[PDB]
Design an enzyme around this catalytic site. Structure first.
Site, mmCIF file in Angstrom:
data_model
loop_
_atom_site.group_PDB
_atom_site.id
_atom_site.type_symbol
_atom_site.label_atom_id
_atom_site.label_comp_id
_atom_site.label_asym_id
_atom_site.label_seq_id
_atom_site.Cartn_x
_atom_site.Cartn_y
_atom_site.Cartn_z
ATOM 1 N N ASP A 37 29.920 47.449 40.855
ATOM 2 C CA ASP A 37 31.347 47.800 40.864
ATOM 3 C C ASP A 37 31.711 49.211 40.363
ATOM 4 O O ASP A 37 32.605 49.858 40.913
ATOM 5 C CB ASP A 37 32.142 46.776 40.044
ATOM 6 C CG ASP A 37 32.525 45.548 40.845
ATOM 7 O OD1 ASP A 37 32.697 45.666 42.080
ATOM 8 O OD2 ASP A 37 32.672 44.464 40.231
ATOM 9 N N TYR A 83 39.437 41.369 49.868
ATOM 10 C CA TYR A 83 40.720 41.835 49.348
ATOM 11 C C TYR A 83 41.757 41.977 50.465
ATOM 12 O O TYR A 83 41.424 42.230 51.635
ATOM 13 C CB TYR A 83 40.562 43.177 48.621
ATOM 14 C CG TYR A 83 40.026 43.076 47.204
ATOM 15 C CD1 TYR A 83 39.408 41.917 46.748
ATOM 16 C CD2 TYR A 83 40.161 44.144 46.316
ATOM 17 C CE1 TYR A 83 38.928 41.826 45.448
ATOM 18 C CE2 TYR A 83 39.684 44.064 45.017
ATOM 19 C CZ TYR A 83 39.074 42.902 44.589
ATOM 20 O OH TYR A 83 38.601 42.816 43.300
#
Ligand SMILES: *[C@@H]1O[C@H](CO)[C@@H](O[C@@H]2O[C@H](CO)[C@@H](O[C@@H]3O[C@H](CO[C@H]4O[C@H](CO[C@H]5O[C@H](CO)[C@@H](O)[C@H](O)[C@@H]5O)[C@@H](O)[C@H](O[C@H]5O[C@H](CO)[C@@H](O)[C@H](O)[C@@H]5O)[C@@H]4O)[C@@H](O)[C@H](O[C@H]4O[C@H](CO)[C@@H](O)[C@H](O)[C@@H]4O[C@H]4O[C@H](CO)[C@@H](O)[C@H](O)[C@@H]4O[C@H]4O[C@H](CO)[C@@H](O)[C@H](O)[C@@H]4O)[C@@H]3O)[C@H](O)[C@H]2NC(C)=O)[C@H](O)[C@H]1NC(C)=O
Ligand SMILES: *[C@@H]1O[C@H](CO)[C@@H](O[C@@H]2O[C@H](CO)[C@@H](O[C@@H]3O[C@H](CO[C@H]4O[C@H](CO[C@H]5O[C@H](CO)[C@@H](O)[C@H](O)[C@@H]5O)[C@@H](O)[C@H](O[C@H]5O[C@H](CO)[C@@H](O)[C@H](O)[C@@H]5O)[C@@H]4O)[C@@H](O)[C@H](O[C@H]4O[C@H](CO)[C@@H](O)[C@H](O)[C@@H]4O[C@H]4O[C@H](CO)[C@@H](O)[C@H](O)[C@@H]4O[C@H]4O[C@H](CO)[C@@H](O)[C@H](O)[C@@H]4O)[C@@H]3O)[C@H](O)[C@H]2NC(C)=O)[C@H](O)[C@H]1NC(C)=O
Ligand SMILES: *[C@@H]1O[C@H](CO)[C@@H](O[C@@H]2O[C@H](CO)[C@@H](O[C@@H]3O[C@H](CO[C@H]4O[C@H](CO[C@H]5O[C@H](CO)[C@@H](O)[C@H](O)[C@@H]5O)[C@@H](O)[C@H](O[C@H]5O[C@H](CO)[C@@H](O)[C@H](O)[C@@H]5O)[C@@H]4O)[C@@H](O)[C@H](O[C@H]4O[C@H](CO)[C@@H](O)[C@H](O)[C@@H]4O[C@H]4O[C@H](CO)[C@@H](O)[C@H](O)[C@@H]4O[C@H]4O[C@H](CO)[C@@H](O)[C@H](O)[C@@H]4O)[C@@H]3O)[C@H](O)[C@H]2NC(C)=O)[C@H](O)[C@H]1NC(C)=O
Ligand SMILES: *[C@@H]1O[C@H](CO)[C@@H](O[C@@H]2O[C@H](CO)[C@@H](O[C@@H]3O[C@H](CO[C@H]4O[C@H](CO[C@H]5O[C@H](CO)[C@@H](O)[C@H](O)[C@@H]5O)[C@@H](O)[C@H](O[C@H]5O[C@H](CO)[C@@H](O)[C@H](O)[C@@H]5O)[C@@H]4O)[C@@H](O)[C@H](O[C@H]4O[C@H](CO)[C@@H](O)[C@H](O)[C@@H]4O[C@H]4O[C@H](CO)[C@@H](O)[C@H](O)[C@@H]4O[C@H]4O[C@H](CO)[C@@H](O)[C@H](O)[C@@H]4O)[C@@H]3O)[C@H](O)[C@H]2NC(C)=O)[C@H](O)[C@H]1NC(C)=O
Ligand SMILES: *[C@@H]1O[C@H](CO)[C@@H](O)[C@H](O)[C@H]1NC(C)=O
Ligand SMILES: *[C@@H]1O[C@H](CO)[C@@H](O)[C@H](O)[C@H]1NC(C)=O
Ligand SMILES: *[C@@H]1O[C@H](CO)[C@@H](O)[C@H](O)[C@H]1NC(C)=O
Ligand SMILES: *[C@@H]1O[C@H](CO)[C@@H](O)[C@H](O)[C@H]1NC(C)=O
Ligand SMILES: *[C@@H]1O[C@H](CO)[C@@H](O)[C@H](O)[C@H]1NC(C)=O
Ligand SMILES: [Ca+2]
Ligand SMILES: [Ca+2]
Ligand SMILES: [Ca+2]
Ligand SMILES: [Ca+2]
Lengths: 388, 388, 388, 388
Positions: free
Chosen positions: D70, D324
């Site tokens: 990430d 997302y």
């Protein structure tokens, strides 16, 4: 900036000169060149560009496998600089879909892309790079449009759509857009019995569209549009010089108001410039397949069912693959007349060249000259063996 | 914007400084760099750019095989940013063809590309990125032009064309264009017996073109053009410092009005700056092949048949391949004088390096300095073995 | 547009925030990324860009073999968009050469590239993308310059050059340019005994350059330039916090007017911001090699020979390779103060990583914050093993 | 140029039309396409663009190994032309970091990137492509923000940040920026118990943000912001149509002021348009994983804890991976209403597809239509096997 008006007649066409060629397949053997098909050319007031439907993959990319497929979610209308190839890094996406048209009105560009499954397709109309209006399928059978540029007059840009069967009577509509908004639409009228993939151009006499009858006719249907009154008529090119593909041999009497028979349920997108004694028709050389391309000067082809060629020009040799062809003009050029132009799609790969698993094309484009210029032939130029 | 006028004299040339170099072949070993040849440089009022004839393929591409070929349907005049290499993604197509010239008139750029088969070639004249005029072959034997920039004065841009034999008397014409339209053309006059590939530059005295006699002369023919009267004269560089390639050794008496004999039916495109005591000539170092390049200061070379060098500068070592060379200047630079510039084409591949199957080039470019600067040598810099 | 004037003081430096990073070596493992070294950053009034000396080849290209070499004919100063990597397709060539500086004066950009052999090098000064002035070697021993941006005031842009030995007394000159023209030059004066590769910045107090003494000193020489009077002085950073590399350990008394001894004939380009209590110095973490980088707040470092750090920030860990570092500021930003910025060159490849045959780098860049921000470390991030 | 004001209501949403799709993973199989994740879309007044966090490597590049990670120093917020893929050569870096937001205020664009280690992260606020303000971590536990566009009104652009635990009470703040400067910030108030990754949009009623409760709730928290008063309230979507993922099955009574229980310590970034009877909610089809995506028309979802769907549209099939999703609108389009838009991130690779070692995504985007358009489904379209 003002809306462009169709105020000029066509320039006298005495020959055709080279205008653009991208050599996309040659270059894409070793470059990130997008797989395309159904290309065209369209001008802005400050620039002319190549257009085509991408397949959302490069030619060398493994996803090029299966690109004979017509309608996937990975297609988009792209545009790119004149005579450059359509690359990943230089191609601008106009909209998403698997059938398209595009034109500039003098102020801004309208682009239309259709997407969806066969029974639930929809058109989205973009104006000045923003979505403005949407149109749902009315026949639930592959809503589809021109695959070449539309034409505008005083802000009004007519577009031809078909929805329904490709092998029988279908529901064709003429839409009239302004700044992307729907002013009016009308059902197809006149004597044309089937309409696909209209190639259009504009001049003071109005807008002329030469299309494809896929159902029964190897002569081409014509739609003539008045963009002020927003009405139209239809018929066929009367000439016995037949211009669809595949097609029967040229007889001595053509047909003005019905399909000339011989080949059913097939055809290719094509074009013509219909202008009295200044009439020129494009066609594949072969009567059996999409190979070769030639222009033929056929006086009054539109109205004269006996008319034959008096002059011609070979564009692509019969030994070389061609494909779709369509019209465009630089409406913002200098001078007293509009210079007729056209492109020919040079299809490479499947189904004709099945040693590769992809299907793509390059573009060659010509414009008219008032000179009587020597002629060449313009192949795609790629060697299939290199892709093996 | 106004048309540019040739109002300045040349700057005093005391040496040459590096101006541009693209290293195209080095970079193209591992990048999508287009195969080219016949390059040049030309300036707009806000930008200077590299120009060349693409072969419609990259160097690593398999279609680079056979690019020794001069005239195919896959060639186009491209331009790209100064000192960048000609890539698929940064190259702008000016027009389609296998022989070219281009120049800006201060308002817009004219580009001319010739295409077609040997016996039916035609030139298309583009102005402001649109085709304006067309010229058909008049001798039916490879209609061809400069391969470097033209020059304009008050909108009038003269261009030299040849059509006919390369090994005998040919039909050379001087055309005078304005905004792409033909104002006038005239047959070659004067004492030059054969004209190819003129390299031109402009200054207050008019336009001077240094060309190539491919037929009999190893001295160079010169064409001097009055762009106001639209007339010209021709002769040879009188100097015994001979500047074609291949060529005999330098004698002590040159020839003003006939070819200097020794080498027939061959030659290379080259250039000179002919300016009284400020005269500099370019030539290959070798007398046998296109290798090396040097500049030589030869006072009154144009008119003095005894003139010899008094100063010089090596540009490319004899161990390194060169090629075409030509003139250009930034007519829109600041100051009271025009700074003489030139490019040298560094040919790599065939026929001299036949381990590879392609032929391409890179570019090196220099401009004059009023200083007496140290000299370097500027090779292409690629290692052929890497392409094997 | 007006010439920019140095009217502001530096912003208070309480920490450093990330500004730019291109990850060039990571990306160039699989992209057409040019091999570079000696990078910097410089701003125009509407844009900030990365700059570096290309080696005329990509990293994956076979011509990357041997790019440890400093001065070839295949180098050029290129610039490219902030935080993008230097690619073949996005890099703009400013000029040709193997040593450079560049700065915008508020109206246009001046770029200077030096080229040639060791004994005959010359600088060419470009202004607004055109060559304007040229300077020949005066010591015939690698004429060379800053390798980071220059600074301008009211059109006057001073530049430091050295010509002569790297291991003994050399001939350093300060040139004062306006619109690329030479206003004045002067020999180096003051107490600095050797000058290389000055990193400069401007503020209301004048122009400050922190350089490299390659001959004897591990403290850094400083040149302070008045751009109005066009004069300068020189000395060393007095602080015992030594900032060259390699270098001795930090003593407790530094040297203001002579080299601090311990390491001869070596060094690295670096920088500092010398501003009373707002003084920050950059240095490699290692005293032996170009690894790591840290900023240290050292009040009055320039004048106080006892001064030590009171605050700091690690930029690159000692485990990670660094390299050249230099200053720049966005002179056209909003606000009442100039925000100090710097870049660090992250060298990958030879001589430290000799499993590969190339030498290149990526860039990380930071600017000052008036906040006390948390710190990270910023490695190049490429894995050498991938290139094997 | 003037600051944009939120003066319009939402257009009536009767269906969704295709707006943009880049096919990045398909194209990146054989092109220099950057590895990304956390994408969004945001408009300038003259252009709309795709945004995402790069991983500083291409997909085919060996450095793509491990891109499930990430927060590395090799990430940056990039933007690129609508529907093009994020390539090395067409992507513009907005700022460096591993969490971001961006929005245009009508005059210029603000971009915010956060970087640093988990316990020492900092945000840098860019305005008009220059760094303006900086914010240090206040909870020392991954300072992080929206991952989709912010919204502005009269120059004031609110942004939601969280710092602290992802599995417990955290410190959420609402910042109010103007021209990149901090006008005001406030601690989160209201009944939302945990806030992550807000997706926001603006209309005359104010700014509405639909976020993610990662701690306990499978219903979504909502933050409603007054950009004039610079205050806000929070609650949950009352509707029993639950929209986080993973999530329990839809009950018949939702929760307005507390998390709906069933799934702890997980969730996905998502969005909604909350507009009385014109309310539409987005969610994954699966309740277990990030697969599929659908829009559901749920009247008064925000306030009615019994509300159920009355209309819907499938966007991505459950067989296809999603990810997302977030909101954006073209605030500078013509007309009397704002057209609701959204994007869905189509995640490919790890952890779901672990035969490859990378993690990336493509983008599909839709906008609302007042027509009732046929629906399609929009997969990423890449075949994992090709990357093996
Ligand atoms: C350098 O470049 C220049 C410029 O390009 C080259 O010059 C060009 O040369 C080409 C090749 O010849 C020409 O194209 C052909 O044009 C003819 C038409 O012109 C001829 O016929 C004219 C009409 O004659 C009729 O009316 C007049 C009165 O109006 C009357 O006098 C006459 O008796 C007759 O009744 C003549 O006017 C014309 O003469 C003029 O021009 C001459 C030069 O061409 C010149 O010498 C004269 O002095 C005078 O000025 C001339 O005789 C087209 O007919 C022809 O197109 C047909 O043939 C090609 C094959 O080449 C074919 O592909 C076409 O499809 C077409 O043939 C098919 O369709 C016909 C119509 O249905 C049908 O009848 C045919 O049987 C055939 O049908 C079969 O094939 C098709 C296709 O597969 C299939 O669909 C059918 O089913 C069936 O199977 C060419 O277009 C250019 O016009 C010419 N241009 C110029 C400016 O000169 C020059 O050659 C180059 N130089 C070098 C060294 O290479
Ligand atoms: C740092 O950089 C600087 C700047 O570049 C370097 O300095 C440069 O050095 C080069 C190399 O020497 C010079 O180039 C040569 O220039 C000479 C011309 O200058 C010489 O001759 C001048 C004329 O003399 C005549 O007239 C004067 C009166 O006007 C009279 O006094 C004299 O007796 C004679 O009658 C002299 O004025 C001049 O002196 C001046 O300059 C000197 C420095 O050069 C200086 O020391 C003096 O004080 C004074 O100021 C000087 O003597 C060119 O002749 C020469 O070009 C020929 O030679 C090269 C080989 O090097 C060859 O490639 C050329 O093609 C050419 O030779 C061919 O053509 C001739 C003409 O036809 C022929 O006669 C030859 O036999 C030969 O022909 C053969 O080969 C060719 C080609 O393959 C073939 O075609 C034929 O068929 C045949 O096979 C060079 O261009 C630069 O001028 C000089 N620049 C400057 C500013 O100084 C410096 O070296 C560098 N430093 C370092 C450390 O490297
Ligand atoms: C989140 O992020 C934040 C922000 O980055 C992090 O906070 C940062 O933490 C770092 C790491 O500690 C700090 O960097 C160091 O700063 C110190 C300087 O500050 C210390 O000393 C100050 C001065 O003290 C002196 O004067 C005062 C009065 O003025 C007097 O009271 C005192 O007794 C003494 O006389 C103190 O003022 C200061 O205290 C203040 O700040 C504290 C926090 O730091 C705070 O707790 C206090 O309350 C107060 O407010 C503090 O004590 C630098 O000295 C240091 O740099 C040296 O050490 C590093 C190794 O870490 C080394 O790389 C440097 O090169 C240097 O050491 C070399 O050089 C020296 C000078 O010559 C030499 O003496 C050394 O022996 C050494 O030399 C050797 O190595 C070098 C290099 O290889 C070689 O060349 C030599 O030859 C030789 O071999 C660091 O820069 C930041 O300042 C700090 N920032 C902030 C805002 O707090 C935070 O840690 C992060 N959080 C987490 C959880 O990670
Ligand atoms: C061409 O394109 C067009 C345009 O897209 C296509 O037309 C579309 O077709 C789709 C597919 O059917 C429709 O989407 C569904 O919409 C329904 C809602 O509409 C239905 O119900 C309405 C409300 O009825 C209630 O109130 C009315 C009064 O207001 C009352 O009369 C009625 O009795 C009832 O009380 C009806 O009004 C509506 O009728 C209208 O529209 C009809 C056409 O749809 C038309 O024929 C009628 O004449 C009239 O005009 C209609 O009956 C949604 O309910 C549905 O969403 C649910 O189902 C999908 C699966 O398909 C699922 O993915 C959703 O998540 C959701 O189901 C879950 O959630 C529910 C709520 O919590 C739950 O109850 C379910 O059990 C289920 O929960 C489970 O799964 C989820 C997800 O995994 C999980 O989270 C849970 O835990 C649990 O496991 C669809 O969205 C479009 O609306 C429709 N559009 C248009 C314009 O017509 C057309 O099909 C295409 N043509 C072709 C040939 O393909
Ligand atoms: C086209 O015609 C309209 C209406 O007569 C006029 O207003 C407009 O300016 C015209 N466009 C151009 C380019 O002249
Ligand atoms: C060149 O000369 C013409 C005619 O004398 C003049 O009108 C024009 O403005 C001139 N061009 C420039 C750039 O001054
Ligand atoms: C180039 O083409 C010829 C065939 O004409 C072939 O024999 C040769 O191997 C080719 N070279 C390469 C590199 O394939
Ligand atoms: C800098 O100073 C000069 C001379 O005082 C002035 O003319 C110029 O406009 C100034 N530049 C700016 C940007 O104000
Ligand atoms: C928004 O409102 C402000 C203050 O009322 C006004 O000054 C500004 O011009 C408005 N913006 C636009 C685009 O009208
Ligand atoms: Ca048919
Ligand atoms: Ca000759
Ligand atoms: Ca040193
Ligand atoms: Ca949750």
């Amino acid at each position: 900036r003002n809306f462009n008006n169709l105020t000029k007649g066509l320039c006298t066409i005495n020959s055709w000169h080279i205008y653009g060629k991208d050599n996309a397949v040659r270059i894409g053997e070793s470059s990130d060149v997008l797989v395309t098909r159904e290309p065209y050319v369209s001008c802005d007031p400050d620039e002319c560009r190549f257009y085509a439907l991408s397949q959302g993959t490069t030619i060398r990319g493994k996803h090029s496998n299966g690109t004979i497929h017509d309608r996937s979610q990975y297609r988009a209308l792209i545009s790119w600089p004149l005579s450059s190839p359509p690359t990943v890094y230089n191609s601008r996406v106009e909209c998403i879909g698997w059938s398209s048209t595009s034109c500039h009105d003098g102020k801004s560009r309208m682009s239309i892309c259709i997407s969806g499954p066969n029974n639930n397709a929809s058109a989205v109309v973009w104006y000045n790079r923003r979505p403005v209006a949407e149109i749902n399928t009315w026949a639930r059978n592959i809503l589809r449009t021109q695959e070449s540029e539309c034409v505008c007059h005083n802000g009004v840009c007519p577009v031809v759509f078909t929805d329904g069967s490709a092998t029988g009577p279908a529901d064709t509509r003429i839409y009239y857009f302004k700044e992307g908004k729907i002013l009016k639409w009308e059902s197809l009228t006149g004597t044309a019995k089937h309409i696909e993939e209209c190639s259009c151009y504009g001049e003071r006499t109005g807008i002329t569209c030469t299309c494809k009858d896929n159902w029964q006719g190897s002569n081409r249907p014509v739609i003539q549009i008045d963009p002020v009154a927003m009405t139209h008529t239809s018929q066929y090119i009367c000439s016995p010089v037949l211009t669809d593909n595949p097609r029967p041999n040229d007889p001595n009497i053509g047909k003005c108001n019905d399909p000339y028979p011989g080949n059913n349920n097939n055809g290719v997108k094509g074009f013509s410039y219909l202008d009295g004694a200044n009439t020129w028709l494009g066609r594949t050389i072969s009567t059996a397949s999409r190979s070769g391309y030639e222009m033929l000067k056929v006086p009054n082809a539109l109205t004269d069912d006996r008319s034959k060629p008096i002059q011609g020009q070979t564009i692509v040799l019969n030994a070389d693959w061609s494909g779709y062809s369509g019209s465009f003009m630089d409406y913002w050029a200098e001078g007293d007349c509009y210079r007729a132009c056209f492109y020919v799609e040079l299809i490479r790969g499947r189904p004709k060249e099945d040693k590769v698993w992809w299907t793509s094309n390059s573009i060659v484009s010509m414009c008219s000259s008032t000179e009587f210029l020597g002629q060449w032939n313009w192949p795609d130029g790629a060697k299939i063996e290199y892709f093996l």
